[PDB]
């Protein structure tokens, strides 16, 4: 018997198929997070600015209180 | 003064140890082994380049120019390493009367390094890489100041010391959501190792500020060009990041500040490997045509916000 190269089929590798698929973000869903992060962003930032006003008047008060300076 | 000397020598080492990361992280991004033979993990190779490029490499250009050319690597380091001084850090070296103004002015002055390298060779071959470097930087200086102004009006004044104190509960990434995305692109205004970048890398054209320069001036250019990448990474970690302040313990700040910057340090080399060059014409169309109306609309938005709800330092 003579032995040569043998053939293999099984699944035939599956040639030409789109492996690319959309993931995580769809379109409308990411905009709700996007503007949602903005709405949370400005609201939390301005609370510290109002807290800065408590310091702002009190810091400049030191110059008014000190006249022997 | 000891602080300045303790901010050049360890900083030049950080630009030296960058060369590891420039082909280790970039290597694994391309599925290839970087530094391995020279040191335990190639750690002796970055310090070997300083022995390689300066002591033995001798070139001076042919037709040349007069005093200029060799003036340009002095202009490269002596304007980009000075940028470390106005940095707020835990504590700044001579805290400026207005902080970010010195940061924006010296960055534009650092562009001259690639500009004077155009007249390094009198031949026309080198200045094409210089003329391309003009437009790839000149347009992006517009938004770089505008996007700053929208952040600066939101929090404090120009002083960099106030920018640390303003972020006590949450980061500035969340209120400035589209503006933070802009500072991954606008930071790459200077000739940096990136996909957007400028006329510095090879790929298509001849290497700008490298084809005219030797090894010794050319080696001095990399110690300045890669230094700007860390500088923009730290500057983003001040304007957009913060987490905590703590004036009592400087140890808790120094560890936490470095991790935030190092995550951004990887991110620019992440950009560099991933994407091709944007072309000379079409980079001028990304901004100006498309991004400048977007940034000004957000600049219009950030003017109204302190008036709408109280936000004045």
User: Major β-sheet of chain B, in short?
Assistant: none
Distance between the termini of chain B: 33 Å
Alpha-carbon Rg of chain B, integer: 20 Å
> What sequence of helices (H) and strands (E) makes up the elements of chain A?
H
First-residue to last-residue Cα separation of chain A: 114 Å
Kindly state the number of beta strands of chain A. 0
Relative helix content of chain B = 40-55%
- Tell me how many strands of chain B there are: 0
* SSE pattern of chain B, N- to C-terminal: HHHHHHHHHHHHHHH
Oligomer: part of a larger assembly
Largest sheet of chain A: none
Class inferred from helices and paired strands of chain B:
mainly alpha
The Cα radius of gyration of chain A reads: 35 Å
Our estimate of the beta-strand percent of chain A is under 5%
Shape of chain A: rod-shaped
Number of helical regions of chain A = 1
Task: Estimate the strand proportion of chain B.
Answer: under 5%
- Our count of helices of chain B gives 15
Organism (chain A): Bos taurus (Bovine)
Subcellular location (chain A): Mitochondrion inner membrane; Nucleus
Protein name (chain A): NADH dehydrogenase [ubiquinone] 1 alpha subcomplex subunit 13
Subunit structure (chain A): Complex I is composed of 45 different subunits. Interacts with CARD15, but not with CARD4. Interacts with STAT3, but not with STAT1, STAT2 and STAT5A. Interacts with OLFM4.
Describe this structure in words.
The relative contact order of chain A is 0.05. Chain A has one helix and no strands. Chain A has one helix at residues 28-65. The longest helix of chain A has 38 residues, at 28-65. Chain A is rod-shaped. Chain A has 69 residues and is mainly α. Chain B is mainly alpha-helical and 313 residues long. In chain B, α4 (71-80) runs parallel beside α11. Chain B starts with 8 loop residues before the first helix and ends in a 5-residue tail after the last helix. The chains are: A mainly alpha (69), B mainly alpha (313). The A-B interface holds A 34, 37-38, 40-42, 44-46, 48-50, 52-53, 56 and B 154-155, 166, 168-170, 172, 174-177, 305-306, 309-313.
